[PDB]
Write a protein that binds this ligand. Structure first.
Ligand SMILES: CNc1nc2ccc(S(=O)(=O)N(CC(C)C)C[C@@H](O)[C@H](Cc3ccccc3)NC(=O)O[C@H]3CO[C@H]4OC[C@H](Cl)[C@H]43)cc2o1
Ligand SMILES: [Cl-]
Ligand SMILES: [Cl-]
Ligand SMILES: [Cl-]
Lengths: 99, 99
C-alpha cells in the first residue's frame, strides 16, 4: 500500500497472539511496545528519545504480522507512551519512504 | 527518491542558509531541531516522546529545504537528541510510506 502522512500512520499488528495498534515510525531504530507478555529469553536495555531514556525488556526473534506481512525481529517492551514499529521490522516488510 | 530503512533515513536540510543533518521521521507529528537561532517571535510548546516531554520554541512559516525539496512551515527548537523532520514538513515534500 501507499500510506499517506496527513495523519499518523497507524496500523494493526499481530504479536504474541494479541492485536495491537502501532505507529509506522521511520525515526525509531527499534520496535517498542507497551507492557505485554512475550515468550522466551530477554535482556534489559535503555532506549533514548525526546525526553530521555526508558528501561525496556529486549526480546529477540519474535514473530509479528503487519498488514498481512509476516516478519521476525526484536521487540522492546516497556513504558512507552505509544507503540511504535521501528526500522528493524519496517525493512522486513519492504517499507520505504518515497518523494 | 526511494529511501530504504536498513540505516537511519538521514538527509541534509538547509535552514537559515546552513546545512544540517536530520532524520526523516514518520513517527513525529512535528519537526524538532537542536538549539539554533531563528528569526521572529516564538510561542511555547511542550512535545512528548519516549522519555517524557520537553519544552521547545515554536517558530512559524520558516523556509527549510529537505533533500533539496522546498518547504515553509513550523519548526520547533529545543533539546532534542537528534534533528527530526516530522509529518508537518514530510507532507510538504510529498513523502509517503510504501510497501
Ligand atoms: C506533538 N508534536 C510532536 N512532534 C514530535 C517530534 C518528535 C517526537 S519524538 O518523541 O522524538 N518521537 C515520537 C514517537 C516516539 C511517538 C519521534 C520518534 O521517531 C523518535 C525520534 C527520535 C530519534 C532519536 C532520538 C530521539 C527521538 N524515535 C525514538 O524515540 O526512537 C527510539 C526507539 O528506537 C530508537 O531510535 C531512536 C531513539 Cl534513540 C530510540 C515527538 C513529537 O511530538
Ligand atoms: Cl531485529
Ligand atoms: Cl530492500
Ligand atoms: Cl507546518
Amino acid at each position: 500500500p501507499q500510506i499517506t502522512l496527513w495523519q499518523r500512520p497507524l496500523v494493526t499488528i499481530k504479536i504474541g497472539g494479541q492485536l495491537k495498534e502501532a505507529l509506522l515510525d521511520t525515526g525509531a531504530d527499534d520496535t517498542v511496545l507497551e507492557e505485554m507478555s512475550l515468550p522466551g529469553r530477554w535482556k534489559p536495555k535503555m532506549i533514548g528519545g525526546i525526553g530521555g531514556f526508558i528501561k525496556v525488556r529486549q526480546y529477540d526473534q519474535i514473530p509479528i504480522e503487519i498488514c498481512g506481512h509476516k516478519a521476525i525481529g526484536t521487540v522492546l517492551v516497556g513504558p512507552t507512551p505509544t507503540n511504535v514499529i521501528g526500522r528493524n521490522l519496517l525493512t522486513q516488510i519492504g517499507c520505504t519512504l518515497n518523494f
